[PDB]
């Protein structure tokens, strides 16, 4: 279909597949154990 | 006596440039001949430079429907507004295209404008609208109005950059209002008689 | 228990391994990326040993490590097997998925041990995936020996073995060299490493 | 709905954020590599 | 949605959250509703306690609770199901499934445009005239 093509075409122009690819490459941050052995686990509302 | 735009006509795009506070009239040109892009010439200094106008007109070769150009992709009309129309460039006979490419004149969405050797696919064809609300979408268009061109590929306004210090013009989402202006009427034409913008030569002494 | 393991639980069960599923026929010709499966491999098996999987999630991983491991070449999830060797004859909840897995493996590359060339292009064994098979077939067999009945697992237990049978060799020679002093490095039951 | 909302957005290019414009926008990884920074930032990410 | 419940089942759920009423707020805690299932019967691992008290604080109105327990209480539906299925037709006792007797499949509940039950045919793979009562239904979705 030329209108789901074209729909395509300018949703993939619109963001470049790099520009995807780097965010899914954008590291985590995991949860450490202090020297109680309390978790330190950072707030999920203010990170990645 | 209202005149109105059909199709075999030669017209020149223009557009206005605002630059430093200065109203300038600038015409889409190409050179199909070793560079398909297209550029900006100057006419409103045409006392002091004389513009380039040979290069700078367009036929409009067909005017069909939205629909009908559908369906033409699946398997002398006076100009109304909302139809598709196919732009050929006299000197190169090339056809106006959206070129899907960009030289990174800062927006990375935009898409270059410039001409394609074949008629075939959604590139070549562009989408007139009214300009102000005294006109709407059917009515036969006037040689004194300012239109607005959408490609059908990209649905990217024939948008004039500001980017750089110098002038562009792209396919981007920014709508640039286009002024159509007549250059040439085939049918109106005289065979044998001299018209504007004639290639020829002078036969002084005796023809020879 | 942390927020940060479980929403990347969900993301990886949700957006990342479906994906994987749905593009896992695409993995024919990855031999040329050894190192890169025999991790995602390792690291699909141990997220799937997890305990706080819910069973939508244990499902998902499941169905997404299935479809990876068809279509593997057969010399290529040896690793993923010395690692399943130590975890299959214990038969926990957790064991009914690594039974699928090798149940599938061995009804599909069973030309692979077999009969001598077997597959004509892609191999045979090494002698060495040949003596994990037949340990293998010997731990599960005598673990479902002196294991209680319950049905459900030796329906699912019973083509494994049939399998594993079936693909051995039947006059295989059992190595005189019996493997002296096996690294028992991540080969471990208290901590996994 | 899609086809007309992709036109709406693209119509209104204002609508993908100040790093989708086009014009200076520096794309979409390093603009979500630069709110991972304000994050962490205390003076500004809060009411300050 | 109030569809997969009925009027008739939804009164247990009431009863059961009544037993600690006081307008529902009051004590209806994570450790509190984990028990109201207790009188159902059906036993949620500890893991699906938190799982769904998160995706809707520690008090659960009724409006909650309804809403949480209406989308996972679906299930175990093929219990009843599968005396429906020998029911319907084909008392004979031949085991043959009749092409004739598929006819009463095809009527549009709210289309009444025909010519599409032919592609419910073509849409049936001959794999092995002959369909069982449970797999008709079974093998198009998932």
Redesign the interface.
Known sequence: KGEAIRIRSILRSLIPLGDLVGVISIAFQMPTIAKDGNVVEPDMSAGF | EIQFLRTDDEVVLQCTATIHKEQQKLCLAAEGFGNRLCFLESTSNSKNVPPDLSICTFVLEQSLSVRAL?EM??NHRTLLYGHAILLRHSYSGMYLCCLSTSRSS??????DVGLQEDTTG?ACWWTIHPASKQRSEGEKVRVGDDLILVSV???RYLHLSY?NGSLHVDA???QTLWSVAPISSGSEAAQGYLIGGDVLRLLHGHMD | ATDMALALNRYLCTAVLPLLTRCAPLFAGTEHHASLIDSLLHTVYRLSKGCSLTKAQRDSIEVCLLSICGQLRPSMMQHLLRRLVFDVPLLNEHAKMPLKLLTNHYERCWKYYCLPGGWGNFGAASEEELHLSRKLFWGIFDALSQKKYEQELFKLALPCLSAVAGALPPDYMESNYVSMMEKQSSMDSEGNF | NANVVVRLLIRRPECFGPALRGEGGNGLLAAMEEAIKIAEDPSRDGPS | MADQLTEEQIAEFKEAFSLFDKDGDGTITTKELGTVMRSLGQNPTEAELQDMINEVNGTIDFPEFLTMMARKMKDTDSEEEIREAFRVFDKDGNGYISAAELRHVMTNLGEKLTDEEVDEMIREADIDGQVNYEEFVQMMTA
């Not at chain 2, 800062?106 to 898409?111: E, G, P």
């Open positions: 559908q992709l699946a800062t927006d990375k969405l935009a898409f959604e590929s990209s649905e980017g981007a989402f920014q």
